[PDB]
Short mmCIF file of C-alpha atoms and ligand atoms in Angstrom, two decimals:
data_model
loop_
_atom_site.label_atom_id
_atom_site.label_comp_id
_atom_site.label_asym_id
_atom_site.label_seq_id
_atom_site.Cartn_x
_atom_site.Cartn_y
_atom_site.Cartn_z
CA UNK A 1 109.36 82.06 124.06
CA UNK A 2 106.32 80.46 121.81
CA UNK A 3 104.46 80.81 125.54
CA UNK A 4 102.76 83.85 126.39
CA UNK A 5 101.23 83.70 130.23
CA UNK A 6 97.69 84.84 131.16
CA UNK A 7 98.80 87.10 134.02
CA UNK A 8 101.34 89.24 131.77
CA UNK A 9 99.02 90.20 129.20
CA UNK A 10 96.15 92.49 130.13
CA UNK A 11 93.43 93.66 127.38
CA UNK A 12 92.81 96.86 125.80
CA UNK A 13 90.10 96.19 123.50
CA UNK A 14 88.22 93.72 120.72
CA UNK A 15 89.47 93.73 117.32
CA UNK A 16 87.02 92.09 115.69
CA UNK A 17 84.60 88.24 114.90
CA UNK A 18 86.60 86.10 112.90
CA UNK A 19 85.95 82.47 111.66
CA UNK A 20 85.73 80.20 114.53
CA UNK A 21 86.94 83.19 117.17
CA UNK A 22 86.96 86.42 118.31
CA UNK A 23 90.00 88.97 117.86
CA UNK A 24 91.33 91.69 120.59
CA UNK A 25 94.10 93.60 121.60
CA UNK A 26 96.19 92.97 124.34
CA UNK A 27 99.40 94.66 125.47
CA UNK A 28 102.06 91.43 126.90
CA UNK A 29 103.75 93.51 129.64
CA UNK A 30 106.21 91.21 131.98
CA UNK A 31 108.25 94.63 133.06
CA UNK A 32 105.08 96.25 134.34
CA UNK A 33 106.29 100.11 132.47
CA UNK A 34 103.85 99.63 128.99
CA UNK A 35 107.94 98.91 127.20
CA UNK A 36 106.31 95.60 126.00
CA UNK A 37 104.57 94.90 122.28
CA UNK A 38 101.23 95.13 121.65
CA UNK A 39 99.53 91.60 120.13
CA UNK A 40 96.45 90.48 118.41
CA UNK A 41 94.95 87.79 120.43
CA UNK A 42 92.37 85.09 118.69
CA UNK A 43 90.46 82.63 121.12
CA UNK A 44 87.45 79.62 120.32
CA UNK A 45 87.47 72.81 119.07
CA UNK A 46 88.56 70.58 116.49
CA UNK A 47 88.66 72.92 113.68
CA UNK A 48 89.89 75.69 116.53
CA UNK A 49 92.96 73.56 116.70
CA UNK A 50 93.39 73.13 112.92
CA UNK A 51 93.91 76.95 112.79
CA UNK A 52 96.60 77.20 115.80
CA UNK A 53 98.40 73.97 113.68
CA UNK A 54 97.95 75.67 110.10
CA UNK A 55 99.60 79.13 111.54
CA UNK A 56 102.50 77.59 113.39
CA UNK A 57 103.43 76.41 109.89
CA UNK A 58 103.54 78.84 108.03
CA UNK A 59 106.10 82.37 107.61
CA UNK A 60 105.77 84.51 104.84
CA UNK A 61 106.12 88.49 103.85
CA UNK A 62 102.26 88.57 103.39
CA UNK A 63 101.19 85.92 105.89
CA UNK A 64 100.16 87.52 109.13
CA UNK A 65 102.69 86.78 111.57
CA UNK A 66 102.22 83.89 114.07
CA UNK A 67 103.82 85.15 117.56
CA UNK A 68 102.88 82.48 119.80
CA UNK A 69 100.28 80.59 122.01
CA UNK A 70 98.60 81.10 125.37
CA UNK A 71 96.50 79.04 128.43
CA UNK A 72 92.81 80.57 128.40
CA UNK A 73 93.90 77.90 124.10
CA UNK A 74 94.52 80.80 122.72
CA UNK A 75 96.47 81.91 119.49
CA UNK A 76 98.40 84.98 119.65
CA UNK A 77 99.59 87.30 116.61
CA UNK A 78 101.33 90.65 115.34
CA UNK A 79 99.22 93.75 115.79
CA UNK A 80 98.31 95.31 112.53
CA UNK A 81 96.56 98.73 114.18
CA UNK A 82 95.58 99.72 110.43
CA UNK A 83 93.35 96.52 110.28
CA UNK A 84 91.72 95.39 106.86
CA UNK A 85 90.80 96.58 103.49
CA UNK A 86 87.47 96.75 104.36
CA UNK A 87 87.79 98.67 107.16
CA UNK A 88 90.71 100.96 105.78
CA UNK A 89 89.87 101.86 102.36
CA UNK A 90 86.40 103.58 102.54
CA UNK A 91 88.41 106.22 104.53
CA UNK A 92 91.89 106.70 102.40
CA UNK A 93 91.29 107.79 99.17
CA UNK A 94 94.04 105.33 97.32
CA UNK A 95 95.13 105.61 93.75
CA UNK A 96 95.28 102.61 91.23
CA UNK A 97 98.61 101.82 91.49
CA UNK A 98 98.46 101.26 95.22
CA UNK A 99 95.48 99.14 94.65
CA UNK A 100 97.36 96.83 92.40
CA UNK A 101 100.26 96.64 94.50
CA UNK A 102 97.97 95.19 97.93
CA UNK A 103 96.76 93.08 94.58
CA UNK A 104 100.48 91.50 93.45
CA UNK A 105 101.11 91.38 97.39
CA UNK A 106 97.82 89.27 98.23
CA UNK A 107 98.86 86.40 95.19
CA UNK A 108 102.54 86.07 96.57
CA UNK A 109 101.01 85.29 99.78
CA UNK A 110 98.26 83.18 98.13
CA UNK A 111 101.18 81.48 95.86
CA UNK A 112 102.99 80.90 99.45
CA UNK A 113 99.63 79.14 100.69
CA UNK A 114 98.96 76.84 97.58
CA UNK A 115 102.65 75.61 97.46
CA UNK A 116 102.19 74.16 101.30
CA UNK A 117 99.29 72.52 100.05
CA UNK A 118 96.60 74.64 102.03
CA UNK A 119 93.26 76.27 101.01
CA UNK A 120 92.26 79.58 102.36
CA UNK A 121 88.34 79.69 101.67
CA UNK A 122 87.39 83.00 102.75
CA UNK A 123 89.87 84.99 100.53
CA UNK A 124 87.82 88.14 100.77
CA UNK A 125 88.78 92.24 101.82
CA UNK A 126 87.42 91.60 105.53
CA UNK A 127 91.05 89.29 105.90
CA UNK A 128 93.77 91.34 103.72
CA UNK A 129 95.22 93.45 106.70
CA UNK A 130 97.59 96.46 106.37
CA UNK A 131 100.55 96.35 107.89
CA UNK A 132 102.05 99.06 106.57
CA UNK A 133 100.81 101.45 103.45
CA UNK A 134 102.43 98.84 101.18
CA UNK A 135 102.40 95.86 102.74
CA UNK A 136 99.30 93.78 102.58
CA UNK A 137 98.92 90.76 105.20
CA UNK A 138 96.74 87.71 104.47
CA UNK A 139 94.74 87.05 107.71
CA UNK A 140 91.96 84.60 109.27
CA UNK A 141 93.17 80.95 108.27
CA UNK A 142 89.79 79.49 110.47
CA UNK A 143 88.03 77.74 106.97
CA UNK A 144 91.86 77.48 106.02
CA UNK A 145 92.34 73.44 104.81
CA UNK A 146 95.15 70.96 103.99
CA UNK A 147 94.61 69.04 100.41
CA UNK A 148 94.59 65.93 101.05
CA UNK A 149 94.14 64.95 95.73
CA UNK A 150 93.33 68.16 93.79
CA UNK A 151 90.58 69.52 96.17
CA UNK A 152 88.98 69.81 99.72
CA UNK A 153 85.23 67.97 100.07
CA UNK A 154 83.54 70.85 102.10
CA UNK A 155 80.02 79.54 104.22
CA UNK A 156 80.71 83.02 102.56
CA UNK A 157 78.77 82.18 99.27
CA UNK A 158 79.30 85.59 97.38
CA UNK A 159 83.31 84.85 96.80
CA UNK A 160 82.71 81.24 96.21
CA UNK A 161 82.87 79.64 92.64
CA UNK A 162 79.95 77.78 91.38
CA UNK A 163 82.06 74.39 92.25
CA UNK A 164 82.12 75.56 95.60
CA UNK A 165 78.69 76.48 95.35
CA UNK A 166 77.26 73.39 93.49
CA UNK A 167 79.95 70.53 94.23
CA UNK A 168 81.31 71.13 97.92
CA UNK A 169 84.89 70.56 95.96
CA UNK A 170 87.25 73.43 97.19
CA UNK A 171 89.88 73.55 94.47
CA UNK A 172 93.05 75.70 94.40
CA UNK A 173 91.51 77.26 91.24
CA UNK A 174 88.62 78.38 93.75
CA UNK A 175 90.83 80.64 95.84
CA UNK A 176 91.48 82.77 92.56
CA UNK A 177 88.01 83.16 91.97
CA UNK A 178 87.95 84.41 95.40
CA UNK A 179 90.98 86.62 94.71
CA UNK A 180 88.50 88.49 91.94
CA UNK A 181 85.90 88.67 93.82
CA UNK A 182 88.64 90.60 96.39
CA UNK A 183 90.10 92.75 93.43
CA UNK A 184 86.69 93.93 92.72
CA UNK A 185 86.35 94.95 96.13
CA UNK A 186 89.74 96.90 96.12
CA UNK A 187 88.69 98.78 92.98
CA UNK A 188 85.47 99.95 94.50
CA UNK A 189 87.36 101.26 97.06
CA UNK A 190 84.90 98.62 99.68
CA UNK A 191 82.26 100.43 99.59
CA UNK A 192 79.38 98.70 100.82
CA UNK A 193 76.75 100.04 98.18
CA UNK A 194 78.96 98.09 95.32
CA UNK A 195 80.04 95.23 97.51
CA UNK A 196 79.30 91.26 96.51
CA UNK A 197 76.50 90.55 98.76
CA UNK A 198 74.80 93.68 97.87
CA UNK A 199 75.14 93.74 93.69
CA UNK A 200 74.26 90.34 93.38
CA UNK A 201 71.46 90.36 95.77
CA UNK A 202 70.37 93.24 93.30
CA UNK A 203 70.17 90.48 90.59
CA UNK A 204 69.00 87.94 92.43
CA UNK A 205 66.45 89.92 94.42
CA UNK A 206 64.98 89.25 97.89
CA UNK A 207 61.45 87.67 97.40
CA UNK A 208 62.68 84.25 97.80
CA UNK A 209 65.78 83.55 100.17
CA UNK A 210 65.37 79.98 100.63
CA UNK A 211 67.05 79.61 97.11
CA UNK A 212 70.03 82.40 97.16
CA UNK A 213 72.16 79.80 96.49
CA UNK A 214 70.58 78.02 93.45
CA UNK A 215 69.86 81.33 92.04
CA UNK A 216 73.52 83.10 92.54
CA UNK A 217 74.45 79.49 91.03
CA UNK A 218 72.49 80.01 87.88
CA UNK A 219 73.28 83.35 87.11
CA UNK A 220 76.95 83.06 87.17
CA UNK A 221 76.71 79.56 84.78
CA UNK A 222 74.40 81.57 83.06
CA UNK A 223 78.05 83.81 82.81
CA UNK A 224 76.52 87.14 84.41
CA UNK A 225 79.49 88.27 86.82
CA UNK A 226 79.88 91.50 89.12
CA UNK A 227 79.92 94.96 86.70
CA UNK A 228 83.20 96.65 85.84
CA UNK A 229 83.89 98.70 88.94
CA UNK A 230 84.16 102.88 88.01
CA UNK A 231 87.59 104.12 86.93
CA UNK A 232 89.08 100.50 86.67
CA UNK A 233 90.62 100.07 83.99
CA UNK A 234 89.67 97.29 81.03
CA UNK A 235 92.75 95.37 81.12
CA UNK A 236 92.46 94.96 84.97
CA UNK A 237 88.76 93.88 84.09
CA UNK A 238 89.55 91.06 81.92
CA UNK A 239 92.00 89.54 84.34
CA UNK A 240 88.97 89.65 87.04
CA UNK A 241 87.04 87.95 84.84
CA UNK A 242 89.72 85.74 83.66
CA UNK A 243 89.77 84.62 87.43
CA UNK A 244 85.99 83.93 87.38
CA UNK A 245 86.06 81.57 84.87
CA UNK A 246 83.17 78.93 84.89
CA UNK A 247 85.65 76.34 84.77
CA UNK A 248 88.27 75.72 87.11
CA UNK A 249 90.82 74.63 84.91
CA UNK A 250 90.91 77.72 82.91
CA UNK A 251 91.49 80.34 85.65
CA UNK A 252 95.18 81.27 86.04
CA UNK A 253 97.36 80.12 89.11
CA UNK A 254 98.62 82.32 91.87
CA UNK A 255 101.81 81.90 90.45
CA UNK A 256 100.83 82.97 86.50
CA UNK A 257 99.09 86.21 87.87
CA UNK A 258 102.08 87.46 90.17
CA UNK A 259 104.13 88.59 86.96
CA UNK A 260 101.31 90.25 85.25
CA UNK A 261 100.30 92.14 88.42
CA UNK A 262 103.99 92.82 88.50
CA UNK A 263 103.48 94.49 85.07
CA UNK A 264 100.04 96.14 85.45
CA UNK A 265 101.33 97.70 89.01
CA UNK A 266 104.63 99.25 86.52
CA UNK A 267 102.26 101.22 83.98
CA UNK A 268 99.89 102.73 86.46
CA UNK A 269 102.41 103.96 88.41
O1 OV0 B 1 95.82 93.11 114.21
C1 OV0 B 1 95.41 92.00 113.92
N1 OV0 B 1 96.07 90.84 114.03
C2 OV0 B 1 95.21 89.74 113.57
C3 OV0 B 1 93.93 90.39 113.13
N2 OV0 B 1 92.81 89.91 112.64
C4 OV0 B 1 91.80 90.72 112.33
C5 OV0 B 1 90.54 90.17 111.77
C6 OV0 B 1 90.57 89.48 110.55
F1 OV0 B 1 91.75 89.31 109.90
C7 OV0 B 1 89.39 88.96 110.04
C8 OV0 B 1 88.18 89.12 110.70
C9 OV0 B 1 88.14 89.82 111.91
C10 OV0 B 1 89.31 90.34 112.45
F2 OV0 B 1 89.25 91.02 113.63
C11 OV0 B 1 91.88 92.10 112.51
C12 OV0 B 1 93.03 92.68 113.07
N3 OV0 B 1 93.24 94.05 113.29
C13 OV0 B 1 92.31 95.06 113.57
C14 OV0 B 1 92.79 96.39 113.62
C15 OV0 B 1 91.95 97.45 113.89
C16 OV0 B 1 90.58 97.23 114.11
C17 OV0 B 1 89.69 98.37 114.41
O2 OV0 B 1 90.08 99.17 115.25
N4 OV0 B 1 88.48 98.56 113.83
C18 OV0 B 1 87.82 97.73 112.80
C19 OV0 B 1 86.50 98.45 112.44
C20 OV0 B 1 86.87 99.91 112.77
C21 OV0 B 1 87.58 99.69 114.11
C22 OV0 B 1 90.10 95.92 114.08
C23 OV0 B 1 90.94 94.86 113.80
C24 OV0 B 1 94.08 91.78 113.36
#
């Protein structure tokens, strides 16, 4: 049952370029009548592996669902047909409430994640799939990591924390970071003229790439973070910037921020 075979399945298209693979639709049809579901198929070596082993383990409500594996080897998942954030929300006009919901839904998945003692590193819009209009699915686990110890010795730069950035030290503090840098990106709604890459660029500027890094590192030590995104809300703000935090230490948990999303969600609605 955990074994899909290569002459049952038969492709319809690509989904997408994830970390470490590239994502496309098959339909797995054994009866030969199109009855059979439709599944998300990821294919490459070491860290390949790492990501079929990190999946198998884990089952969660806003984890994307781990189906099986296949001979090409291949790892095989649910079909989400909406696919992500970033792809979904330019197009749907949807309301704050809504937003804060995918929000709450993203740190219960996040708080799942932690507590097994894995790191994400690339919690960003491009892997927050819909499954449904309010259900949120945390995808793409290829940087995902096991802590070994209170961090991972370690590249998508503009979610990353300056101890990321400065340290190679992946903390579970730096995934919340992350998730700011993501609830920024739901509140503008994805739209590429106010994502990360491009408003920090804007303050960093373009006349010397050899030091993005040093100088995205600077500014945010300096404490200059991403603007207050239109129509969001102060409140909602703060706890963005709560989660970017210079230090680690004082950003909330996964866990602290679920009940206050819980309770920001409530009052827009
Ligand atoms: O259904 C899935 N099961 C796993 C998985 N992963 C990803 C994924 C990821 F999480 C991170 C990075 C890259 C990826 F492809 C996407 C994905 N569903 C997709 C659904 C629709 C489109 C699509 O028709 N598009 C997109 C542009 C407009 C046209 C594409 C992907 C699934």
């Amino acid at each position: 049952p955990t074994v899909f075979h290569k002459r049952y399945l038969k492709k319809i298209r690509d989904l997408g370029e994830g970390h470490f693979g590239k994502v496309s639709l098959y339909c797995y049809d054994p009866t030969n009548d199109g009855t059979g579901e439709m599944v998300a198929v990821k294919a490459l070596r070491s860290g390949w592996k790492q990501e079929i082993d990190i999946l198998r383990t884990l089952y969660h409500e806003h984890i994307i669902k781990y189906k099986g594996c296949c001979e090409d080897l291949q790892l095989v998942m649910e079909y989400v047909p909406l696919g992500s954030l970033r792809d979904y929300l330019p197009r749907h006009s949807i309301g704050l409430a809504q937003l804060l919901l995918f929000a709450q839904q993203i740190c219960e998945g996040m708080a799942y994640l932690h507590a097994q003692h894995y790191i994400h590193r690339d919690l960003a819009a491009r892997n927050v799939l819909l499954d449904n209009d309010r259900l949120v699915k945390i995808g793409d686990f290829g940087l995902a990591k096991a802590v070994p110890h209170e961090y991972y010795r370690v590249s998508p730069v503009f979610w990353y924390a300056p101890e990321c950035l400065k340290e190679y030290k992946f903390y579970y503090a730096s995934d919340v970071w992350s998730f700011g840098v993501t609830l920024y990106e739901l509140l503008t709604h994805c739209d590429s003229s106010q994502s990360p890459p491009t408003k920090f660029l804007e303050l960093i500027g373009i006349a010397q790439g050899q030091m993005t890094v040093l100088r995205l590192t600077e500014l945010l030590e300096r404490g200059e973070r991403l603007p207050r995104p239109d129509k969001c809300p102060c409140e909602v703000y703060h706890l963005m910037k709560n989660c970017w935090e210079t230090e680690a230490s004082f950003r909330p948990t996964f866990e602290n921020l679920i009940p206050i999303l819980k309770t920001v969600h409530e009052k827009y609605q």
